[PDB]
Structure 1
Amino acid sequence: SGEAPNQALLRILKETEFKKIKVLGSGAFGTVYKGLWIPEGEKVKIPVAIKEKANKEILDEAYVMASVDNPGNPHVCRLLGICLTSTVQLITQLMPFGCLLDYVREHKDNIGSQYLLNWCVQIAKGMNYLEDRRLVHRDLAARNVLVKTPQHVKITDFGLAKLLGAEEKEYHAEGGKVPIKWMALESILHRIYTHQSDVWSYGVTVWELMTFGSKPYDGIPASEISSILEKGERLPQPPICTIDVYMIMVKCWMIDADSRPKFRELIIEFSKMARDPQRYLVIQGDERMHLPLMDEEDMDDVVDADEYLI
């Protein structure tokens, strides 16, 4: 009974009010397009993305993708509204550089240390916000992050985002087709999903970005990981990874869920590094790479107040 009313605001739009241009995707569900939204009256043109049955209807996808949109996090992808033609249209803001997994594989050779550590602050900022709304994303990966600008990235493709009650901090799952590679040990065993289980996936997400779009547990069938992690083995140290940057990812994989760091601590740990990225990421040609300043003595553990949230 003692819960907060979900006062989210869904919006309905017309298929005549969109001027769809190119085809972004053709997935095994629907299709995403490079649209453009020109509203009635207003002298505006907004770049948008457009999605397009057997047993249940698709709406659960958009229900969570609007409840979190009440206060606004700038690093969490948002839904503008929907169109109700015979074949319904889901309409979001356009993030022109695609997913981040295709940005660390295509632009792999021009990724500065600054660009990397920053994307890791943004993902923990947007992932801290989802925790503040008691929601568990359950699919934090490089592929579920889009590029608004090379500097501004946002978390997308919720899919399994589960809301939690006032006196609730756990989740019971029924299996499915969830990627075991990114899954925390509890999720695999007695199928528990908490905010701390998303931290393990954050550890894999950043590990992916440090290996420049590499395959976690490459050449490995998804059935041994259950006991392979029980023995103690984990993903091995990336090359550009100083012991500072790497030990964060290791501490995100501590079996006792309380030992993993909270996303507010991850924002702090990485924000420090983003002030001097040279000392933490060893990239061959660091300063000569590109993609489209101090004032104190013991400026070491110094963090700005915008990134301090206890």
Structure 2
Amino acid sequence: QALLRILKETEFKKIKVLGSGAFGTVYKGLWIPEGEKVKIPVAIKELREANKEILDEAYVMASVDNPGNPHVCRLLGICLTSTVQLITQLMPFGCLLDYVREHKDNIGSQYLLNWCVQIAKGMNYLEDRRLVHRDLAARNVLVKTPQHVKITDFGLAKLLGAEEKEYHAEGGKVPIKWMALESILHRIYTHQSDVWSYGVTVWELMTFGSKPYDGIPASEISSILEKGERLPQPPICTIDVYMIMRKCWMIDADSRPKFRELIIEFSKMARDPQRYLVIQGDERMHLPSPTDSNFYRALMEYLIP
């Protein structure tokens, strides 16, 4: 059952813009609940320009909130002022796309492989709740801590009915360079087209946030994929890691890995990370962890088809 907590605007203080983009505008703030004096750091989202879309996103998030999962973003509630806003716990390290681009020189193999495991765990949770995300990408993964990531942005996500295996889209804007070939050609989305997007997300992490098919127009992508061309092997990836990405991009959807299998394979690689990713100076790299004494110091695309 989907239940939204409507948080009174008078409960929020110190709201400041964090940034804007295709996702709309995100602000940070402090939520002081009624009765309790706790000051909870929150992120607040508004869409660009509209109420229909953000409420649909709230519904999807509330629908999959029970039992929930550590690698899936959960909605604290919504706020009704001049716009409808979504409220969630603030992820102080931001989105994983910007994080990999900014901390490239300190991201070791263990971190990249554990992020792959965690994103697959969050997606496996969503598949069990019959949810097709349709927008998995490094820009829609958030960093709670350098060691703990969460999937966010349910703006395009759809719940499949009990007797439904696929979602047939209309003409809304969609991320072509992260989509399976069948989604580009026939507007068909399934858990296996989310696996294709997962493969593209992994490629983004392994290249430290490179743009996929950079300088290639979205209208040429279907023909590139029908010719058998795929994103290149990242220079840190051994063949075993690249072969997982290539399996995610197979034409036959049922031949692609399942999220349950990706959890197992990436967990195996995370048990011996320097065998699977070759990074110069890997053993010397460090990122802040909540187990560190000084961790508190650290806390101070879409087109019409």
TM-score, normalising length: structure 2: 0.90
The 2-side partners of 1:54 and 1:179 are apart by: 19
The 2-side partners of 1:308 and 1:64 are apart by: 20
Q: Which of 286, 293, 296 matches 1:305?
A: 293
Residue by residue over 1:34-90, the C-alpha shift from the partner in whole angstroms, topping out at 9 and shown as x without a partner, is 111111222422111112476846411211011111211011011111122233332
| CA gap 1:29/1:107 in 2 versus in 1, 3 angstroms | closer
Unaligned 5+ runs, structure 1:
1-6, 293-302
| CA gap 1:15/1:178 in 2 versus in 1, 3 angstroms | same
The 2-side partners of 1:54 and 1:291 are apart by: 39
The 2-side partners of 1:58 and 1:309 are apart by: 19
| CA gap 1:165/1:16 in 2 versus in 1, 3 angstroms | same
> Is the partner of 1:91 in helix, strand or coil?
strand
The 2-side partners of 1:305 and 1:185 are apart by: 48
The 1-side partners of 2:267 and 2:293 are apart by: 11
Query: Computing the radius of gyration over CA atoms, which structure comes out larger, 1 or 2?
Result: 1
Residue by residue over 1:171-203, the C-alpha shift from the partner in whole angstroms, topping out at 9 and shown as x without a partner, is 111233212111101001111111000111111
Structure 1 position 28, deviation (Å): 6.2
Say whether the 8 Å CA contact 1:8–1:70 is kept in structure 2.
Answer: no
Q: Which of 17, 33, 36 matches 2:30?
A: 36
Say whether the 8 Å CA contact 1:97–1:149 is kept in structure 2.
Answer: yes
Aligned to 1:296: none
Q: Which of 235, 260, 264 matches 1:264?
A: 260
Residue by residue over 1:159-180, the C-alpha shift from the partner in whole angstroms, topping out at 9 and shown as x without a partner, is 1111011111011112332121
Q: Which segment is superposed worse, 102-111 or 38-47?
A: 38-47
Say whether the 8 Å CA contact 1:145–1:155 is kept in structure 2.
Answer: yes
Residue by residue over 1:218-245, the C-alpha shift from the partner in whole angstroms, topping out at 9 and shown as x without a partner, is 1111111111111111111110000111
Q: Which segment is superposed worse, 43-52 or 262-271?
A: 43-52
Residue by residue over 1:105-125, the C-alpha shift from the partner in whole angstroms, topping out at 9 and shown as x without a partner, is 100110010000000000000
1:114-263 matches, within 5 Å, as 114-263=110-259
Unaligned 5+ runs, structure 2:
295-300
Greater fraction of residues in helix: 2
Residue by residue over 1:13-50, the C-alpha shift from the partner in whole angstroms, topping out at 9 and shown as x without a partner, is 11111113431123467532111111122242211111
Say whether the 8 Å CA contact 1:20–1:33 is kept in structure 2.
Answer: no
The 2-side partners of 1:151 and 1:212 are apart by: 16
The 2-side partners of 1:150 and 1:18 are apart by: 27
Structure 1 position 308, deviation (Å): 35
The 1-side partners of 2:37 and 2:143 are apart by: 26
| CA gap 1:246/1:304 in 2 versus in 1, 3 angstroms | farther
| CA gap 1:280/1:65 in 2 versus in 1, 3 angstroms | same
Identity of aligned residues (%): 98
The 2-side partners of 1:116 and 1:289 are apart by: 12
Residue by residue over 1:265-284, the C-alpha shift from the partner in whole angstroms, topping out at 9 and shown as x without a partner, is 00000001111111111001
> Is the partner of 2:76 in helix, strand or coil?
strand
Structure 1 position 157, deviation (Å): 1.0
